[PDB]
Amino acid sequence: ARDSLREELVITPLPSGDVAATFQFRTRWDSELQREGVSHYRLFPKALGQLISKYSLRELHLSFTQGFWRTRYWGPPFLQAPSGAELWVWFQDTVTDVDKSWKELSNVLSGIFCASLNFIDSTNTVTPTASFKPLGLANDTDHYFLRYAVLPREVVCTENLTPWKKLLPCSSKAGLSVLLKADRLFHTSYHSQAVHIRPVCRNARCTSISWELRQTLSVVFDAFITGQGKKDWSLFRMFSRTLTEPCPLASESRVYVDITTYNQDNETLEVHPPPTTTYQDVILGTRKTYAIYDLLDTAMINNSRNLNIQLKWKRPPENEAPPVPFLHAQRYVSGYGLQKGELSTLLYNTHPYRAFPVLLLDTVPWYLRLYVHTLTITSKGKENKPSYIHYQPAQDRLQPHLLEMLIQLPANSVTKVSIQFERALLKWTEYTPDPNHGFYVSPSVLSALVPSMVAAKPVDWEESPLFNSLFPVSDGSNYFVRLYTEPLLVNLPTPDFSMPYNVICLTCTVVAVCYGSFYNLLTRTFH
Amino acid sequence: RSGHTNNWAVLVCTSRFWFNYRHVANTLSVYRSVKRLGIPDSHIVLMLADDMACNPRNPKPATVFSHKNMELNVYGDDVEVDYRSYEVTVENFLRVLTGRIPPSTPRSKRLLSDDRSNILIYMTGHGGNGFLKFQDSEEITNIELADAFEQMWQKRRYNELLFIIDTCQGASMYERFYSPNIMALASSQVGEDSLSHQPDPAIGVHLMDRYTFYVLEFLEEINPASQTNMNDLFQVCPKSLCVSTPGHRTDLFQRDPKNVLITDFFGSVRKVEITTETIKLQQMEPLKYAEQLPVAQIIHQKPKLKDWHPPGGFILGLWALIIMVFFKTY
Amino acid sequence: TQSFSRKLPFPDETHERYMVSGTNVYGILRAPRAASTESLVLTVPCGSDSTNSQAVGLLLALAAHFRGQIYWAKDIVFLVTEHDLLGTEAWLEAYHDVNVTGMQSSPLQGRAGAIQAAVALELSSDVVTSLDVAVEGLNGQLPNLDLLNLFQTFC
Amino acid sequence: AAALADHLPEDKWSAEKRRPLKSSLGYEITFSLLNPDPKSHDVYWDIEGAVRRYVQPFLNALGAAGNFSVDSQILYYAMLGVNPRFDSASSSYYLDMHSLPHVINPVESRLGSSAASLYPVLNFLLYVPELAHSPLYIQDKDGAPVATNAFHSPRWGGIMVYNVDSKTYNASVLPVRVEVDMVRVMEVFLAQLRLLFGIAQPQLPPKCLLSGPTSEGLMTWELDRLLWARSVENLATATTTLT
Ligand SMILES: *[C@@H]1O[C@H](CO)[C@@H](O[C@@H]2O[C@H](CO)[C@@H](O[C@@H]3O[C@H](CO)[C@@H](O)[C@H](O)[C@@H]3O)[C@H](O)[C@H]2NC(C)=O)[C@H](O)[C@H]1NC(C)=O
Ligand SMILES: *[C@@H]1O[C@H](CO)[C@@H](O)[C@H](O)[C@H]1NC(C)=O
Ligand SMILES: *[C@@H]1O[C@H](CO)[C@@H](O)[C@H](O)[C@H]1NC(C)=O
Ligand SMILES: [Ca+2]
């Protein structure tokens, strides 16, 4: 029909010995979802399909990760998202009230995905000046219509996996969505549940608009937690279920297994079932190759030939692993008391030939009063003046600090951007039910064009696998990456919650003793 | 024979901190039974003040267990939490019952019950005399709960209501009810407060409250087409089994409990009419993706950072009057 | 690893050390389900003598056990300091990135978040007769009593 | 009787009089096509043309009493709540009246979180039985299959079981392109909608005629009866709310 579905599972053995699995469920609809009158839905979920017309959306990206992608020890991810719930949306030009529509959309998404996106308020919401460019077709990125919020302390469980799975056409009943057992997906060191809606063109010549819904699920299986042994990395081991019949709705249903060694140009990884074919491509920076298992192939998977892809992989010797992915960050909190500290985020450029620009976005939730005159960017032991600096200050309880900087990372080097903050004392009815746990500083965003080891080719988003069409590649010799640092646990000074009534009496008693002393002096005549 | 049509359910866990795993397990056991017996997720307003289902401290992620044998995961593969974490407040709870929720609230986060609706309300957590602690911070009292139930009845937002509470001294949370069709269960009586504590060696914290555990065991043996009645659930937990005395309350229900099926609140047996009627109808230029990091463009989008200086108007204005005061005195 | 060096005011007449220079080696158990925001520290204060060789072995054996568990809400830092307390001070200063004692070190390539609790196992014998806890800190400060209650209950 | 349903005294005839829909400003009408096995059935169903040609005239007639927000949907792998019994006498499968109250729960789990308003939603499911029980029938009271293979719930929507036949091919089973007779489907769905809004059959005096069915679907005096009931029910609701 007009709409098509393609599901894909990419298995990447990580350099640290872990194994990452990414599920992609791309639905493309050649329909006019931006306006009303599309009341008839077949593969594109009705719940998400109504949102585009109701609230004038252009792109909707909502992710529900637990964990933190260790870029240093794992590789660069196909798609990373911050811990907690991330939601950024581009609205259409014809909205005229962006914050009201943003509030309504956040509430509706909280209803759909059973998350606390109703907590997205003006204190969490941020308008990046130019960080989260639209991922689909854009006439002009205005950024007046871009909203971005993140809730770092937003748990993801099968509480959010069930609504997420309900939106799939083969709703966890056949095809590639049968490997989505919750107890196996959450037995992991990283879990992502992103949903992306974006204007993608209809054909080879992008002259019309067709809406694409990607439901991605990135998961990383720890070697010591899940494997801890000499058994192969089978689909059964990691998902407790093999692959039965494919999704009949899917136009293409494939499993990609990364079989790529380093310091070696042959001797790929060993996969037990002979794959359909092999797809070699420059994916992020390196020419890596995959074994393909086409589920829409009765030779590969019969009605009684369930597929259990096995992968022989263990943490390679240190003289056989990729060095580091040319860019990683590490955010932390300096100081040790209350009332004062520093938000510092180291960001590394391990390429020993090429400086590259990096866009750092920081959101600080207005109870860590930032002092922007203390913002330093060393980058060599010298001082590195950012190419572009934007800073919106925070109004207490109504707006967060936003800090966007274009730092040119010089060489193989560590850039230490730090900024001092002072912890605020809040009202007693302003702390969470667990006030002594602390508050979360949202993970900082790090958008860069990292240089690639080998130059990529311009490839259409239809022939290419689903993991190679997340970001609209622009240069070719540089690939775009968006890192997220860790969420920061910052403790605030706390008032004594058990004494709100004694304090009133005591302070009013001090006022009263002053009043009595001045009364007994301004009215009492000496005698 | 009951007249209800809807069969909603509100299940609440007012507890955090992963050592209250027993309360999340109570709520999820009632939820599992209710969802197995028929009530859809859209008609269940589930509240879990903390996940404890796959928080990092869980030895078995994405599971909540009822028994040490770990053979019945009440937190199954099909579960939806409408209110969780800091959203589960006494304010939000009373908003859901009384309908006074903020207008942006979606359908799934509200109790859209009508005059033909049977409602099951299950509250679990620390609870003292005629009061239930919400996440160790705030309070709901039996006065407020009775007032909310009366407000529900005024608008005819329920046909019959079954209230179940599994807290300490829980028979006094339903001691101030006046709304016409409510029958209430409780784990313990006005006085007993002894709280059981037998932590599972495998899962560090306690599993259940031993009352809803037997309610779960009672509800596991029935099918959607079961004729078991409220009189068979009024003695599901004897004094020999749960240390506390589970006391019910039928002073409001018009219908005899021996005729009220347990599927009338746990599960949704829909009235079915076979339809026999029939209507007899007549019978150019390309588009570009955005540049993710336009380094040249975003530098020039901002006016050049120049060192600030006060305007000439202020300096001239201030300096002129400083001299002016120097001349009135001199 | 963290390389640290310190200029002591005088040779201390106790350890014959004047130009203290050493390396702290720490490993971070990365809490899988957590986002690496809180941490716990298991530290063995190795000195310039043969003591605490069993405590390093026990620390590594516990790291071998803790690694492989999915129930970690906090990172576990396994820290083997170079000197008895100068290494611990160096690591604690570079971790919080303060300079309270004016000691120089190398930048930390990795942190584990806000440290919640810390344990300082000293053990220089295979078998042990009794376990001797110590709760008294610098400048008379004390740990929260629940930590000692926890120790006593697990004894 | 439905409009008041609270001020008149209750008796044996008190629940069927409260069956019809409550008064509301709007109504969502979702036409959901259930396809348990896309592997065997590739169900296509002109739902846009069906709505335009049959429901929109009917909903425009019925629109004097409120706004309607008709939508369509296809749910794949949407199983029913009960397994039909296999009759070893006619090579068919049956769903007796006893099991009909327990048949729509799993699918009504799927229909949730797919509505964009707080109005009462009316779900109309077009179940398409899988080859496991491809000739599925619904039995009214004793054995006899129902004429329309459908049923409805008082304030919920309705369910129609739609059977495909004459699907014989040469080789093994492929997804057979199934075209849904929208006239046949919408006849029962509009009859069910009419019953859900409480417009029963004209309930004649001893001697009269009707002029037969109207092109829109329902008679104008029936619409006026609906507006009378809506006015009374709305006024009663408003006074109760104000007190
Ligand atoms: C905390 O503050 C102290 C000073 O109060 C810092 O110590 C200083 O460390 C630098 C090294 O970065 C020393 O400079 C070195 O001097 C030698 C000899 O002059 C030279 O050859 C080296 O190239 C280097 O420049 C400096 O002497 C030293 N100051 C003192 C008084 O000892 C310390 O580094 C601070 N902490 C941290 C973590 O940086
Ligand atoms: C599976 O499919 C192909 C061709 O049908 C072939 O490998 C084999 O005959 C089939 N059966 C099994 C058990 O592999
Ligand atoms: C129903 O539609 C009419 C036609 O535009 C509109 O005027 C009216 O406001 C709508 N009803 C509601 C409740 O919005
Ligand atoms: Ca719900």
Question: How far apart are alpha carbons C111 and C113 in whole angstroms?
Answer: 6
Q: What resolution does the deposited structure have, in angstroms?
A: 3.1
DSSP category for residue A426: P
Question: Do the Cβ atoms of B158 and B18 come closer than 8 Å?
Answer: no
For residue B314, give the 3-state DSSP assignment. helix
Tokens standing for residue A472: 């609209």
Burial string for D137-168 (b: 16+ CB within 10 Å, else e) reads: bbbeeeeeebebbbbbbbbbbbbbbbebeeee
Catalytic annotation, residues of B: 126, 168
Q: Is A178 on the interface with B (CB under 8 A)?
A: no
Question: Do the Cβ atoms of A371 and A421 come closer than 8 Å?
Answer: yes
Tokens standing for residue D237: 């609701």
Widest Cα–Cα separation across chain C: 49
Helix (H) or strand (E) holding D194: helix D182-196
For residue B251, give the 3-state DSSP assignment. coil
Which residues are CB-neighbours of A476 under 8 A, at least 6 positions away? A455, A456, A457, A458
Atom of ligand 3 nearest to the CA of D67: 1
Binding site membership of C105 for ligand 1 (Cβ less than 6 Å): yes
- If one counts every other C-beta atom within 10 angstroms of the C-beta of residue B15, the result is 27
Q: Helix H segments across B80-236?
A: 90-98, 142-154, 212-220
Amino acid at C22: G
* Side-chain half-sphere CA neighbours of A502 within 13 A: 5
Question: How far apart are alpha carbons C86 and C79 in whole angstroms?
Answer: 13
Domain residue extents for chain B: 8-259
The position carrying tokens 């934007």 is A390
Question: How far apart are alpha carbons A421 and A431 in whole angstroms?
Answer: 19
List the beta strands (DSSP E) in C13-82.
19-29, 38-45, 75-81
> Which chain A residues contact residue C67 at CB under 8 A?
224
Supply the DSSP string of A345-369, one letter for each residue: EEEEE--SS--EEEEEEEEE-SSEE
Question: Where does residue D77 fall: left (phi above 0), alpha (psi -120 to 50 degrees), or beta otherwise?
Answer: left
Question: Do the Cβ atoms of D123 and D157 come closer than 8 Å?
Answer: yes
Tokens standing for residue A210: 């067709």
- If one counts every other C-beta atom within 10 angstroms of the C-beta of residue D169, the result is 8
Closest CA to C94 of C108, C80, C111: C108
Question: Where does residue B312 fall: left (phi above 0), alpha (psi -120 to 50 degrees), or beta otherwise?
Answer: alpha
Q: Is C35 on the interface with B (CB under 8 A)?
A: no
Q: Which residues pair with A90 in a beta bridge?
A: A59, A146
Is D153 in Cβ contact with B3 (below 8 Å)?
no
Closest CA to A439 of A361, A495, A366: A366
Is B86 in Cβ contact with A433 (below 8 Å)?
yes
Question: How far apart are alpha carbons D31 and D51 in whole angstroms?
Answer: 9
Closest CA to B293 of A359, A502, A183: A359
Question: Do the Cβ atoms of B27 and B48 come closer than 8 Å?
Answer: yes
Question: How far apart are alpha carbons C89 and C153 in whole angstroms?
Answer: 30
- If one counts every other C-beta atom within 10 angstroms of the C-beta of residue D132, the result is 13
Question: Do the Cβ atoms of C111 and A332 come closer than 8 Å?
Answer: yes
Which ligand is in closest contact with the Cα of D26?
A: 3
> Which chain D residues contact residue A45 at CB under 8 A?
114
Phi, psi of A256 (to 5 degrees): -105, 130
Return the residue of A nearest to B304 by Cα. A388
CA C151 distance to own-chain centroid: 17
Helix (H) or strand (E) holding B3: none
**Helices and strands in chain B: count of H runs, count of E runs:** 6, 10
Closest CA to B140 of B187, B174, B180, B178: B174
For residue A67, give the 3-state DSSP assignment. strand
Query: Angle at Cα C124 formed by Cα C151 and Cα C23, nearest 5°?
Result: 95
Would you say how long chain C is, in residues? 155
Is residue B226 classed exposed, middle or buried when 0-12, 13-18 and 19+ CB atoms within 10 A define those classes? middle
* Of D18, D100, D240, Cβ closest to residue B3: D18
Tokens standing for residue A394: 């925070």
Query: Angle at Cα B232 formed by Cα B228 and Cα B234, nearest 5°?
Result: 135
Question: How far apart are alpha carbons B41 and B79 in whole angstroms?
Answer: 8
Is D38 in Cβ contact with A171 (below 8 Å)?
no
Q: Are strands A277-282 and A4-13 parallel, antiparallel or unpaired?
A: unpaired
Which residues are CB-neighbours of D71 under 8 A, at least 6 positions away? A39, A40, A41, A46, A50, D28, D29, D30, D31
Helix (H) or strand (E) holding C36: none
Amino acid at A289: T
Question: How far apart are alpha carbons A256 and A21 in whole angstroms?
Answer: 10
Question: Do the Cβ atoms of D79 and B12 come closer than 8 Å?
Answer: no
Closest CA to A289 of A168, A465, A121: A465
Query: Angle at Cα A169 formed by Cα A163 and Cα A172, nearest 5°?
Result: 60
* Of C32, C111, C114, Cβ closest to residue A222: C32
3-state SS record for D138-161: EECCCCCECCCCEEECCCCCEEEE
Question: How far apart are alpha carbons D87 and D80 in whole angstroms?
Answer: 18
Which ligand is in closest contact with the Cα of A299?
A: 2
DSSP category for residue B241: T
DSSP category for residue C108: P
Gap between the terminal Cα atoms of chain A? 105
Question: Where does residue A267 fall: left (phi above 0), alpha (psi -120 to 50 degrees), or beta otherwise?
Answer: left
Residue D8 Cα, gap to closest chain A Cα (Å):
39
Give, using CA atoms, the residue closest to atom 8 of ligand 3. Answer: D67
Residue C80 Cα, gap to closest chain B Cα (Å):
26
Tokens standing for residue A453: 């080891």
Gap between the terminal Cα atoms of chain D? 22
- If one counts every other C-beta atom within 10 angstroms of the C-beta of residue A207, the result is 12
Q: Are strands A57-67 and A195-201 parallel, antiparallel or unpaired?
A: antiparallel
Question: How far apart are alpha carbons A9 and A309 in whole angstroms?
Answer: 11
- If one counts every other C-beta atom within 10 angstroms of the C-beta of residue B133, the result is 17
Question: How far apart are alpha carbons A406 and A412 in whole angstroms?
Answer: 18
Question: How far apart are alpha carbons B211 and B26 in whole angstroms?
Answer: 9
Structural gaps in chain B: residues followed by a C–N separation over 2.5 Å: 283
* Side-chain half-sphere CA neighbours of D170 within 13 A: 0
Amino acid at B270: R
Is C96 in Cβ contact with A336 (below 8 Å)?
yes
List the beta strands (DSSP E) in C8-128.
19-29, 38-45, 75-81, 104-105, 114-119
Q: Which residues pair with A348 in a beta bridge?
A: A328, A414
Question: How far apart are alpha carbons C89 and C20 in whole angstroms?
Answer: 12
Question: How far apart are alpha carbons B111 and B94 in whole angstroms?
Answer: 11
Per-residue CA distances from A382 to A331, A476, B222 (Å): 20, 32, 74
Question: How far apart are alpha carbons B83 and B86 in whole angstroms?
Answer: 8
For residue B29, give the 3-state DSSP assignment. helix
- If one counts every other C-beta atom within 10 angstroms of the C-beta of residue A223, the result is 21
Tokens standing for residue A227: 């494997």
Question: How far apart are alpha carbons A84 and A101 in whole angstroms?
Answer: 22
What angle separates helix B212-220 from helix B21-37, to the nearest 10 degrees? 20
Amino acid at A382: K
> Which CATH architecture group holds B8-259?
3-Layer(aba) Sandwich (3.40)
Question: How far apart are alpha carbons C7 and A111 in whole angstroms?
Answer: 61
Query: Angle at Cα A357 formed by Cα A351 and Cα A358, nearest 5°?
Result: 95
Question: How far apart are alpha carbons A348 and A416 in whole angstroms?
Answer: 9
Question: How far apart are alpha carbons C42 and B100 in whole angstroms?
Answer: 51
3-state SS record for A229-277: CCCCCCHHHHHCCCECCCCCCEEEEEEEEECCCCCCCCCCCCECCCCCE
Q: To the nearest 10°, the Cα dihedral for A350, A351, A352, A354?
A: -130
Burial string for A242-271 (b: 16+ CB within 10 Å, else e) reads: ebbbbbbbbebbbbbbbbbbeeeeeebbeb
Binding site membership of A303 for ligand 2 (Cβ less than 6 Å): no
Helix (H) or strand (E) holding A47: helix A46-54
What angle separates helix A158-166 from helix A98-113, to the nearest 10 degrees? 100
For residue D173, give the 3-state DSSP assignment. coil
Question: How far apart are alpha carbons A46 and A38 in whole angstroms?
Answer: 9
Tokens standing for residue A130: 């130019």
> Which chain A residues contact residue D71 at CB under 8 A?
39-41, 46, 50
Question: Do the Cβ atoms of A488 and A441 come closer than 8 Å?
Answer: yes
Question: Do the Cβ atoms of B292 and A471 come closer than 8 Å?
Answer: yes
Tell me how the structure was determined.
cryo-EM
What angle separates helix A98-113 from helix A46-54, to the nearest 10 degrees? 170
Question: How far apart are alpha carbons B267 and A149 in whole angstroms?
Answer: 38
Give, using CA atoms, the residue closest to atom 6 of ligand 3. Answer: D67
Question: Do the Cβ atoms of A219 and A20 come closer than 8 Å?
Answer: yes
Tokens standing for residue D69: 């927000």
Q: Are strands B160-166 and B182-186 parallel, antiparallel or unpaired?
A: parallel
Q: Which residues pair with D32 in a beta bridge?
A: D73, D125
Which residues are CB-neighbours of A297 under 8 A, at least 6 positions away? A276
Question: Do the Cβ atoms of A413 and A327 come closer than 8 Å?
Answer: no
Helix (H) or strand (E) holding C137: none
For residue A508, give the 3-state DSSP assignment. helix
Per-residue CA distances from A65 to A185, A443, B288 (Å): 12, 12, 30
Phi, psi of A489 (to 5 degrees): -95, 105
Question: How far apart are alpha carbons C53 and C59 in whole angstroms?
Answer: 10
Helix (H) or strand (E) holding A460: none
Which residues are CB-neighbours of B173 under 8 A, at least 6 positions away? B123, B127, B130, B131, B132, B142, B145, B163, B165, B167, B184, B186
Give, using CA atoms, the residue closest to atom 5 of ligand 1. Answer: C102
> Which chain A residues contact residue C107 at CB under 8 A?
346, 414, 416
What angle separates helix B142-154 from helix B90-98, to the nearest 10 degrees? 20
Tokens standing for residue D222: 């029936």
Closest CA to D120 of D79, D148, D153: D153
Question: How far apart are alpha carbons A242 and A302 in whole angstroms?
Answer: 13
Atom of ligand 1 nearest to the CA of C99: 1
Phi, psi of A145 (to 5 degrees): -100, 10
- If one counts every other C-beta atom within 10 angstroms of the C-beta of residue A114, the result is 27
Question: How far apart are alpha carbons A357 and A131 in whole angstroms?
Answer: 13
Which ligand is in closest contact with the Cα of C107?
A: 1
For residue C93, give the 3-state DSSP assignment. helix
Question: How far apart are alpha carbons D47 and A451 in whole angstroms?
Answer: 51
Q: Which residues pair with D145 in a beta bridge?
A: D139
Closest CA to A402 of A439, A442, A433: A442
Tokens standing for residue B107: 């359908």
Give, using CA atoms, the residue closest to atom 14 of ligand 2. Answer: A305
Amino acid at B153: W
